[PDB]
């Protein structure tokens, strides 16, 4: 109840997500019903910095290569 449904999404969404400085969302979750979104009156959106400068003490981006396959 309430915190149980909360912990079963927060512990798997944020940990596999692109980090804080790279991308910024307004609301962490998304409505389903059409009449629900019409009543909420908040803009759902996102801000993406691709080449955001990495701060110290933060994970560097990997440089993964597929190699000989190229697929």
């Amino acid at each position: 109840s309430t915190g149980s449904a909360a912990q079963q999404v927060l512990q798997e969404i944020q940990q596999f997500n692109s980090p804080r400085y790279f991308t910024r969302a307004s609301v962490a979750r998304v409505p389903h019903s059409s009449s629900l979104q019409q009543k909420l009156h908040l803009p759902i959106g996102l801000f993406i910095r691709p080449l955001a400068p990495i701060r110290p003490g933060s994970p560097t981006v990997p440089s993964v290569n597929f190699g000989n396959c190229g697929v």
Partner: protein
């Protein structure tokens, strides 16, 4: 505020009989704390040794009654029940073993090493982790976190064959919203920070952290007791790792607070790491180095 500190550092407070110096009002509200660093068999032994020199007639029996009633008796092995079932407080032994049967035991407010697929933990009758064994179904495991300002904790190495054990603490970073962890590597002779994830076989971002003095010469072996000291100040935390009765195994390092910190209160998960399959690490809260009373 004194016994907020003393509950966290109850590892050495209950190791060299330093709780004996505490008064009657003192140990009553210290035992009522949720941060005591012992198992309740050693809590009962230290309480009875305390009652020997001051107290143990109706008022004295009531003062003893208050001391025992703050101790949870529901985390025992039945063998430790049947060796010290003194016939004056056994009404407590029944109310706590019945919640053992009905599985509604009170919260132990201690750190149990959480079970996972590579570090099995086996208990002796109660909720207290007796030994922590490395199995297979670097690998790490966290014990439960406490809000601390000066805490002490440590374990004894029951058995090891390759001696690759890393000791440290886990800190929840809130400035950058990470879970970066700090420990000590006897192989590199320096303190090491990385980070942890949900699967406990990964410690990423291997990074050297200089500025601490390390004096170690030989690998961890059987019968070695390790003591870990944490002391959170306004800007940094003292991290000491030493071996009891060994002047040649001591180290301390100053890690800067990523989140600088109530009077430096912070939630820290105890940390352990091992590779060797079959390594047993007994969780011993410093069974009493007794002051030999003349």
């Amino acid at each position: 505020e004194a016994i907020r500190i003393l509950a966290g550092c109850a590892y050495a407070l209950f190791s060299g009989m330093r709780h004996l110096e505490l008064g009657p009002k003192g140990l009553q509200l210290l035992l009522l704390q949720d941060n005591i660093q012992l198992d309740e068999p050693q809590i009962y032994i230290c309480a009875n040794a305390w009652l020997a020199q001051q107290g143990v007639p109706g008022v004295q029996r009531d003062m003893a009654m208050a001391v025992y009633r703050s101790i949870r008796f529901d985390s025992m092995s039945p063998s430790q029940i049947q060796v010290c079932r003194d016939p004056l407080l056994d009404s407590l032994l029944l109310e706590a073993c019945l919640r053992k049967f009905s599985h509604l035991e009170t919260k132990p407010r201690v750190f149990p090493w959480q079970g996972n697929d590579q570090f099995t933990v086996e208990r002796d009758g109660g909720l207290y982790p007796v030994l922590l064994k490395r199995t297979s179904r670097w690998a790490w495991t966290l014990g439960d976190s406490r809000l601390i300002n000066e805490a002490l904790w440590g374990i004894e190495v029951v058995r090891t064959a390759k001696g690759r054990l890393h000791f440290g603490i886990a800190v929840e970073d809130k400035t950058t919203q990470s879970r970066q962890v700090c420990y000590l590597d006897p192989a590199e002779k320096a303190f090491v920070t990385g980070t942890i994830t949900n699967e406990p076989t990964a410690v990423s971002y291997r990074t050297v952290q200089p500025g601490g003095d390390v004096r170690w010469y030989r690998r961890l072996c059987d019968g070695d007791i390790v003591i870990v000291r944490v002391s959170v100040t306004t800007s940094a935390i003292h991290l000491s790792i030493q071996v009891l009765k060994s002047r040649s195994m001591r180290a301390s390092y100053m890690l800067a607070l990523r989140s600088p910190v109530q009077r430096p209160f912070l939630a820290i998960w105890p940390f352990i790491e091992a590779v060797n399959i079959g390594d047993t690490l007994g969780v011993a809260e410093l069974q009493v180095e007794a002051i030999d009373i003349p």
